[PDB]
Amino acid sequence: GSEYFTLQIRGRQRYELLREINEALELKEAHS
Amino acid sequence: SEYFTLQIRGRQRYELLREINEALELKEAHSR
Amino acid sequence: SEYFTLQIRGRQRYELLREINEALELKEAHS
Amino acid sequence: GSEYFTLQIRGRQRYELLREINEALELKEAHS
């Protein structure tokens, strides 16, 4: 789809955790 | 600036990551 | 029947998923 | 060989979600 959303994540460590999951899910969707 | 912006493609993934973020925040709030 | 064993490769991913799992369990308890 | 770690996850929907995230992270790592 063409819809983008933003989430404000408190703290660098939590951001990197969620960023990694987000990127991984995006990559998996692209590869499916 | 204590919050970092996560850009997410798709509403389902947004809702998932929002739910996880909320759970992580609650876990932090309850940490000893 | 409600428990499943998640098989994970590597300590880093284990710690990430363990943290999320614990946080989801806590959110459930407070829902 | 790989070093496996295990987590006990309560609930099939939660298990399948965390399994999906786990698999996506594995894919992202494999893709470098």
From TrEMBL, chains A, D:
Cell compartments where the protein resides: Cytoplasm; Nucleus; Mitochondrion matrix; Nucleus, PML body
Domain of life: Eukaryota
Domain p53 tetramerisation residues, every copy: 3-32
Record family assignment: Belongs to the p53 family.
Complex and partners: Binds DNA as a homotetramer.
Function: Multifunctional transcription factor that induces cell cycle arrest, DNA repair or apoptosis upon binding to its target DNA sequence. Acts as a tumor suppressor in many tumor types; induces growth arrest or apoptosis depending on the physiological circumstances and cell type. Negatively regulates cell division by controlling expression of a set of genes required for this process. One of the activated genes is an inhibitor of cyclin-dependent kinases. Apoptosis induction seems to be mediated either by stimulation of BAX and FAS antigen expression, or by repression of Bcl-2 expression.
UniProt-recorded name of the protein: Cellular tumor antigen p53
Taxonomic lineage: Eukaryota, Metazoa, Chordata, Craniata, Vertebrata
Range of the intact protein held here: 198 to 227 of 258
